[PDB]
RNA sequence: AGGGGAGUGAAAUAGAACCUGAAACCGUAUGCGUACAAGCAGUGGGAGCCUACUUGUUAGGUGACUGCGUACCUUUUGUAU
RNA sequence: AACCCACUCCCGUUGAAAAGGUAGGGGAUGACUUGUGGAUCGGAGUGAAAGGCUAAUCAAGCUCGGAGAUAGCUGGUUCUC
RNA sequence: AGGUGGUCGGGUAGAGAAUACCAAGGCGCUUGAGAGAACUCGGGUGAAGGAACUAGGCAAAAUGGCACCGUAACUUCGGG
RNA sequence: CUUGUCGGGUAAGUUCCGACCUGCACGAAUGGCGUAACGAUGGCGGCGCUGUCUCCACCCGAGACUCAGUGAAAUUGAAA
RNA sequence: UGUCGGCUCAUCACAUCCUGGGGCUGAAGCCGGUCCCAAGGGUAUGGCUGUUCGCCAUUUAAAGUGGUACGCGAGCUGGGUUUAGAACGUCGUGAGACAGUUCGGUCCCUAUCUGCCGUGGACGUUUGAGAUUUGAGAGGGGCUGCUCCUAGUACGAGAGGACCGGAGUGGACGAACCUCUGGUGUUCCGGUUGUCACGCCAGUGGCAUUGCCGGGUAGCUAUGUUCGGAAAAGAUAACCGCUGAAAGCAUCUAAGCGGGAAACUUGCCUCAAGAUGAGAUCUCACUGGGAACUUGAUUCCCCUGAAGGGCCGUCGAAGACUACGACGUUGAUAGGCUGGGUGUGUAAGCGUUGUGAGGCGUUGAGCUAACCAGUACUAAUUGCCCGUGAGGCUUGACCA
């Protein structure tokens, strides 16, 4: 039974899960468009969207909280300087998912994760 | 809840220092004895000049438990240990004094003698 | 749970002064002993406090006659007639379950002057 | 029996009486019920009334169901239920509220219980487990024996085995009505009601009566 | 546990009567004219008339 | 890789795993039967359908329904066993 | 602790393994452990002795010969009238 | 997932070549992706009771360091 | 014979401890009777501790389940 | 063809242990004895022993007797018996032997067929479809103690003590649920040991069983909460009768008419038209042409595909995969965002006090999963495939 339970195990320990989604979020803020698996892409938007909301208010205490959840100097500077200012007026929904087929190796359903308003 | 092999101390001056439950009375396959239920005990430690002796089979009433008792409003009362009062053949206390508090569920028609002696009734 | 909260609101009509775990409170409990009714005082230190609105509760602990006893009151039941804080305790926790292993001078709680 | 209303389980709560006793309560919202069809002796055999409740979108009601809901001007709702009545009289287009119940008034409540997926023999049938130590080999929660030797020589039909502690329908008999909030369409029932919050429940007068 | 008599030709072919495959739901990109999977991005990089991957 | 053509050859379904090329076993196509029916799967009776042509006292494929019907060898006083 | 051994539980038993693994366990300056080279063997060797070990084989190794040993015992024995 | 003789072997804690986190150096163990049923394997926590289990406290739980105080019968006078 | 009889321990003891002597069928280097220390040795009893149990509940990983790839085994007179 | 005992799971008989209905009694009452009817439901925990059995201790309304390969090892165990080691007593010169003891000693199998428990796919029910149903039949359930009133009444010299009839409260069993009392809650908040890193200080993060711990939301759950066993009707068993002859009497029977039990059939709960005997009701959809004949329940072509279903996507207290349930822009289905709740327990930074650890203020602060309410910011497309063209024949009754 898993009535009203949230989250996905993804066949990893909770330490593996927590570390995988920091790398995947730090990659998303840097390249602005990444290709990943659909179950992993749906569990990522519960991680990287609370960071973009937190970046909207710039302060020393906020930038200290951001670094603790994404231990990357560049990613903390990527937020608080470009994002949060780009999405200052947007009420949520900062990233978009689009199904894009299946992997050749294992037939795993893939997806595209991208920030909504890339200036390209 | 008290079952067999449970050790529970005495709330009297009947000599017994520690007793152990060996049966729960009042029904077949009955499991637990709460506050106010009759049990069958054996004495495991006794006062040197008491009126009961070690290894004596007799009847007691449960007066105080760690599991506790529920009330109509939904509250609960719990104690820090299980205690019993040793009764004679006619379901009457053997010692004359009673130690510690007791509860109002014992304020029935057959155990009113042990409620009038307790220093506190909760 | 939008109309459950409405059913519960019409029963929350008591004062219930503010208090926190570690305080020494006195609870006046309604007791019936036949046809006449009186009030029995229960004095002890609050060790737990459940904040759920109508289903709120709290637990106090006292040493009665050399035997410890704990009672969990329902905050909004008519049984709990009143409550008064006799002393404010200074603790760093929200549930003081460590007090059950301490007995005498080891179970003292500091005071909160302000 | 013979008449009732359909409601939704809103959740459990409590109410305190002045004497200080707290009564467990299940709150049931009964949106007013609309009569859809009255069944009689000359047309169906038995006697019953057909009832709808709730509200549904216009793109989810089919042309077949829309024309049924339009013969009696009722406006479509979620689900359609039928109550088998002994001797009453209804006309297509009526309203049935909680106002056929009073305080006291033992009732029966029916609902689809919570669904456990695929339960074992310990959970489903209250079997007792083998030893957890003392030499047991990978056979702790397994059922055990299911038959005898050459006599029978086949498992008997009805054997208690594992699978699907169901979301069946169950009735809880002799439940007391505590309060009937007429204006907000509520029924407060003492005790537990089958199903989860939001599910549809049927309330009918107690069949057994007596005590 | 193992069989006592070998299965026949018909007995194993009946078991495979439920082994057929279903076909995917495809659709045609109206603006281009390119067949793609329903609700997926085209193998070229168009979704609902929007270039999204720039090859 | 493997094929479709074209060319050599009397003959490439003699194409280099190459004379002939059977059986078990695996397929595609046509015809008839088969989803209310209980068993060594046949045998006696038997309608309907399909094909061929001598146009129905005919030949070929199928066999709805129904009567009877518990494999073979060995070893034994004796085996569906 | 390393190193040598193998007392308990569980797993594994078509094993990762034709004797292991994870948890605990015994000895650990000695009648100790170990490398390299050498000696003793088939009615014979060696054995702090269990009939134990002598190349996954031991109440008498393996290999080739006598040899197609002998089998009052099981099994099988092929076309027709 | 077995066996194989010898040499070197740093930092911070530590009696230590134990143990934990690291350096130099090396690797992620040649099928994956999901979902989060029974049941099996390896574990964490558990109300009240505390061997009532069982052939049997099997398994588990518990104890665990250094300094100081203190320590019985018996004894082959070493010990325990 | 036999769970001999008596005493101890336990609410209750076919096991254990101390005795008796009626030794079916002990007995003195195939040694008799004791014995400190020692034992992954046999039997019995306590304290602590506990999911061993009353009676199981929840949670975490690896399988089991679904999808893509590779792809066994024992067995088998024929099977409507 | 694996042989005792234990564990888990059972099923039947009745020669009935309890509960139920009766006749006789050397049956005053309360308790009994014996026989008849009755199989619906129930029917101990421990000490000893490998034990079945047995004896003990304390309960219970009662702790039934048997069949099922002395039921049950491709369900578990391995204490006993019955391999290989060793020892005692006895027998034998000896190798050795002993329904005589004693200590130690490997329990394999991925389920094809029948069977059983759940869950689906195909087709049929005579045009198709959406929805609601009747009930032939099947399964589940059925236990019982104590106290009080009648009443200290009937009975009895007294002691003692009821039948019938009501009320309350429990033990065991079962179901549902999570408001309460708790458990869990490696997805929430804190404390803290060792070490490594982010240049450094502060502040944090990795690893150490989640490092060790203290709390804890939703969900799940019991030890927590609520409910259940009925009343009633019928036909009867043993038994008790009324009227009544054969047989002037008598007689429950030969004709006729009654009472009568937890057993049987209903009553309570669930499944149920594949009930091929495939049932019923409401509503909805479809109103074109040609040809070839083997000339009608025929075949072929062109046009036209409705009601509706599915594929697909966002999901769900629904779930192994399915199935079921809700929604798909004319939208709150999921995520985010905004408020709140809940949990934890006074964040970082700065300013004061102190030589420093630390203390104090800003401050119930900071953070906060699964919860409640709102909001289209993100994702549910602007599609495809199935399903047709009014539904055969005969008889009869009402019409025209
Ligand atoms: Mg959810
Ligand atoms: Mg870790
Ligand atoms: Mg579920
Ligand atoms: Mg058990
Ligand atoms: Mg065992
Ligand atoms: Mg094994
Ligand atoms: Mg195990
Ligand atoms: Mg068997
Ligand atoms: Mg048979
Ligand atoms: Mg059964
Ligand atoms: Mg078979
Ligand atoms: Mg066979
Ligand atoms: Mg074929
Ligand atoms: Mg298949
Ligand atoms: Mg050829
Ligand atoms: Mg040729
Ligand atoms: Mg060839
Ligand atoms: Mg050839
Ligand atoms: Mg030639
Ligand atoms: Mg061939
Ligand atoms: Mg064919
Ligand atoms: Mg039939
Ligand atoms: Mg047929
Ligand atoms: Mg058949
Ligand atoms: Mg038949
Ligand atoms: Mg058959
Ligand atoms: Mg013929
Ligand atoms: Mg023919
Ligand atoms: Mg024939
Ligand atoms: Mg035939
Ligand atoms: Mg026949
Ligand atoms: Mg043969
Ligand atoms: Mg023979
Ligand atoms: Mg014979
Ligand atoms: Mg025969
Ligand atoms: Mg045969
Ligand atoms: Mg070595
Ligand atoms: Mg050795
Ligand atoms: Mg060994
Ligand atoms: Mg272990
Ligand atoms: Mg060691
Ligand atoms: Mg080891
Ligand atoms: Mg030593
Ligand atoms: Mg040592
Ligand atoms: Mg040497
Ligand atoms: Mg030699
Ligand atoms: Mg030798
Ligand atoms: Mg060898
Ligand atoms: Mg030899
Ligand atoms: Mg020889
Ligand atoms: Mg060889
Ligand atoms: Mg060799
Ligand atoms: Mg030969
Ligand atoms: Mg010769
Ligand atoms: Mg022969
Ligand atoms: Mg080092
Ligand atoms: Mg190391
Ligand atoms: Mg490096
Ligand atoms: Mg690998
Ligand atoms: Mg995997
Ligand atoms: Mg486990
Ligand atoms: Mg633990
Ligand atoms: Mg705790
Ligand atoms: Mg516990
Ligand atoms: Mg505890
Ligand atoms: Mg203790
Ligand atoms: Mg025992
Ligand atoms: Mg026992
Ligand atoms: Mg141990
Ligand atoms: Mg341990
Ligand atoms: Mg003896
Ligand atoms: Mg004795
Ligand atoms: Mg004694
Ligand atoms: Mg014992
Ligand atoms: Mg001599
Ligand atoms: Mg000797
Ligand atoms: Mg001798
Ligand atoms: Mg000697
Ligand atoms: Mg001698
Ligand atoms: Mg000797
Ligand atoms: Mg001696
Ligand atoms: Mg030794
Ligand atoms: Mg010893
Ligand atoms: Mg004992
Ligand atoms: Mg897990
Ligand atoms: Mg596969
Ligand atoms: Mg059992
Ligand atoms: Mg049963
Ligand atoms: Mg029978
Ligand atoms: Mg009888
Ligand atoms: Mg009886
Ligand atoms: Mg009776
Ligand atoms: Mg009787
Ligand atoms: Mg009688
Ligand atoms: Mg019976
Ligand atoms: Mg019976
Ligand atoms: Mg019975
Ligand atoms: Mg029965
Ligand atoms: Mg019967
Ligand atoms: Mg009945
Ligand atoms: Mg027992
Ligand atoms: Mg017994
Ligand atoms: Mg024993
Ligand atoms: Mg028989
Ligand atoms: Mg027999
Ligand atoms: Mg038997
Ligand atoms: Mg047997
Ligand atoms: Mg038997
Ligand atoms: Mg076994
Ligand atoms: Mg057995
Ligand atoms: Mg076996
Ligand atoms: Mg078998
Ligand atoms: Mg098995
Ligand atoms: Mg044995
Ligand atoms: Mg053993
Ligand atoms: Mg021997
Ligand atoms: Mg001799
Ligand atoms: Mg012999
Ligand atoms: Mg033995
Ligand atoms: Mg051993
Ligand atoms: Mg086995
Ligand atoms: Mg079969
Ligand atoms: Mg029926
Ligand atoms: Mg049927
Ligand atoms: Mg039945
Ligand atoms: Mg029935
Ligand atoms: Mg009197
Ligand atoms: Mg009188
Ligand atoms: Mg219950
Ligand atoms: Mg709860
Ligand atoms: Mg809740
Ligand atoms: Mg609570
Ligand atoms: Mg709690
Ligand atoms: Mg907790
Ligand atoms: Mg916790
Ligand atoms: Mg909770
Ligand atoms: Mg650094
Ligand atoms: Mg620092
Ligand atoms: Mg750290
Ligand atoms: Mg690291
Ligand atoms: Mg932890
Ligand atoms: Mg520790
Ligand atoms: Mg908690
Ligand atoms: Mg439950
Ligand atoms: Mg009746
Ligand atoms: Mg007469
Ligand atoms: Mg008469
Ligand atoms: Mg008559
Ligand atoms: Mg009658
Ligand atoms: Mg009854
Ligand atoms: Mg039908
Ligand atoms: Mg129908
Ligand atoms: Mg549709
Ligand atoms: Mg349409
Ligand atoms: Mg539908
Ligand atoms: Mg789903
Ligand atoms: Mg709106
Ligand atoms: Mg709060
Ligand atoms: Mg902090
Ligand atoms: Mg601060
Ligand atoms: Mg401060
Ligand atoms: Mg303050
Ligand atoms: Mg706060």
Outline:
Chain B has 122 residues and is an all-beta fold. Chain B has strands spanning 7-10, 16-24, 38-46, 57-64, 69-70, 76-79, 83-87, 101-102, 120-121.
- Oligomeric status of the shown chains? part of a larger assembly
* Secondary-structure class of chain D: mainly beta
What is the succession of H and E elements of chain D? EEEHEHEEEHEEE
Rg of chain E from C-alpha positions? Answer: 22 Å
Shape, principal axes of CA atoms of chain E: rod-shaped
Helix proportion of chain D: under 10%
- Give the chain pair forming the largest contact, with residue counts: B-C, 19 and 16 residues
**Helical proportion of chain E, percent range:** 10-25%
Could you spell the SSE succession of chain E in H and E letters?
HEE
The spatial strand order of the largest sheet of chain E comes to 1-2
Structural class of chain E: alpha+beta
Query: How are the strands of the largest sheet of chain D arranged?
Result: 1-2-9-8-7-10
Please compute the radius of gyration of chain D using only Cα atoms: 23 Å
SS summary, helix count of chain E: 1
PDB class: ribosome
Keywords: Initiation Factor 2, 70S ribosome, conformational changes
Entry title: Pseudomonas aeruginosa 70S ribosome initiation complex bound to compact IF2-GDP (composite structure I-A)
Chain A: 50S ribosomal protein L17
What does this structure look like?
This is part of a larger assembly, with chains A (120 residues), B (122 residues), C (114 residues), D (211 residues) and E (55 residues). By secondary structure, chain B is mainly beta. Chain B has strands at 7-10, 16-24, 38-46, 57-64, 69-70, 76-79, 83-87, 101-102, 120-121. Chain B has a 5-stranded mixed barrel with strand order 1-2-3-4-7. The two termini of chain B are 19 Å apart. Helices cover 5% and strands 39% of the residues of chain C. A two-stranded antiparallel ribbon of chain E has the order 1-2. In chain E, β1 and β2 (34-37) form a beta hairpin. The termini of chain E are far apart. The relative contact order of chain E is 0.13. Chain B binds chain C through residues 64, 71, 73-81, 83, 99-101, 104, 119-120, 122, and chain C through 31, 64-74, 77-79, 100. β6 of chain B pairs antiparallel with β4 of chain C, so a sheet runs across the interface. Bound molecules: magnesium ion (163 copies). Residues 134-135 of chain D line the site of one magnesium ion. The structure holds 5 RNA strands.
Provide key terms for this protein.
part of a larger assembly, 5 chains, A: 120 residues, alpha+beta, three-stranded antiparallel sheet, E: 55 residues, rod-shaped, binds magnesium ion, RNA-binding, structural constituent of ribosome (chain A)
Helix and strand layout, with pairings?
The structure is cut from a larger assembly and holds chains A (120 residues), B (122 residues), C (114 residues), D (211 residues) and E (55 residues).
Chain A: H1 14-31, E1 33-37, H2 38-44, H3 49-54, H4 60-69, H5 73-78, E2 95-102, E3 109-115
Antiparallel strand pairs in A: 1-3, 2-3
Chain B: E1 7-10, E2 16-24, E3 38-46, E4 57-64, E5 69-70, E6 76-79, E7 83-87, E8 101-102, E9 120-121
Parallel strand pairs in B: 1-7, 8-9
Antiparallel strand pairs in B: 1-2, 2-3, 3-4, 4-7, 5-6
Chain D: E1 5-16, E2 22-29, E3 33-39, H1 41-44, E4 48-52, H2 63-71, E5 80-83, E6 95-96, E7 104-112, H3 121-125, E8 169-181, E9 186-190, E10 200-205
Antiparallel strand pairs in D: 1-2, 1-10, 2-9, 3-4, 3-6, 4-5, 7-8, 7-10, 8-9
The structure holds 5 RNA strands.
